[PDB]
Amino acid sequence: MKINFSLLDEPMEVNLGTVLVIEDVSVFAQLVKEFYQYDEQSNLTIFDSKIRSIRSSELLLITDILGYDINTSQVLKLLHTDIVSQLNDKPEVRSEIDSLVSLITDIIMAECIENELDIEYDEITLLELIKALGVRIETKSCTVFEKIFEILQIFKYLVKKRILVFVNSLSYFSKDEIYQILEYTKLSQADVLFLEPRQIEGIQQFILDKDYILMPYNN
């Protein structure tokens, strides 16, 4: 997952988490505007190993952390499917749940037989039980750090998003929290690209000087 712009000499590769610091406010604002307008502008080009350019629908752009909606129909559906798989991996728990919903089905069936009208039904499944429970992620009481962590957790659930990009999101988190975010990103394998005006101390990042020189920086 390499990104390239006219200011760079060679296309830079983005693997796992990547912290890109732009020391020039003009090039930073122009790059962010090229991130929002990316479908319209040909200056910023992001391509994969196949050299194929990714569509703006495949690109995931995030600026406001707490304003973004983490709960979507696809995210909640795939999450319910993941929970159903977790319950399916354990035979004993699945057997017990089958017994409980089974007994409930017996009761409701008796109540239906007591009625004068002829009533038919099918089944009460686990996905219907989860949908009836209303399982969803809670962003209401979550701190910004837990919000970005939940975004990194649900990025695997998003199928269409090729790369996640954060705009000036590293100013809220402490150095240790940034270390946790990067260390978790290395395990999640997702491609995250952070854009900050000022460099963060203690983490590996790519620095773009006002001279338009891109250099790797350990601190």
Binding site: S6, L7, D24, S26, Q30, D211, Y212
Partner: protein
Amino acid sequence: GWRTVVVNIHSKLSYKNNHLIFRNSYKTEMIHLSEIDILLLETTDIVLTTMLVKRLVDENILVIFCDDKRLPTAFLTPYYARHDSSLQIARQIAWKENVKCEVWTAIIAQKILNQSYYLGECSFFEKSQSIMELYHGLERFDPSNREGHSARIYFNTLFGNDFTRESDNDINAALDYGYTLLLSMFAREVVVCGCMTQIGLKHANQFNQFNLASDIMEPFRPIIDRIVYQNRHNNFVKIKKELFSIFSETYLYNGKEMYLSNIVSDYTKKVIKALNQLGEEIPEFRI
């Protein structure tokens, strides 16, 4: 190259696909190297790559680096411009003092004659007649110093008796600026010829790297003196711009009307060929 590119703005320069790449935050522009003759950096905020410097050395393009005051600081000199340089060094060591003093005397005669032509175009009969008398009185070894007297009477007649070459005024500053630019172009031409620039054709005691290029650039000084005389009332910035207009303007060579760079290149070629052939023909440049 036909084109003099001057960069006074902060930006980054790269070399891509035989093309000079000017990259800035506001805009980016690509200029081919074959069209570019001279590259001038007028500010200290410009960035460049050593690969572009190597491509400029292979393209034989003069690179000039100025100071924060915009005055030229240091220019790039390639070690080997052509393979004929190593063979020309033996000829330069084999040169004779009679050929050096003869060619230098003829060049000084061309410079004084050009000054008399400038004063004649300026309609000064006594001054151009006196400078012409010094031209007819020029001799080998220069015992009478008629060249320095011609310069003193030239500047003292043009700018007034109270004027002097040792003054710090913007007139002498623009004169040294034009002499530095023409000295840079002539020095680059001498680098193209391959002969040693530090060896002069007049005084073997004076040791300077610009001596030879100055001796070759002596006849062209009045061209700078004209624009300096016309723009002397204007500010030093406008005088510098008018000095930059000399590269765009064309001058009439004895053969035909040519650009300044072509006249300097062909003139230096005829001078080197005349030095190696021991004065076969002396190129003469007139205003």
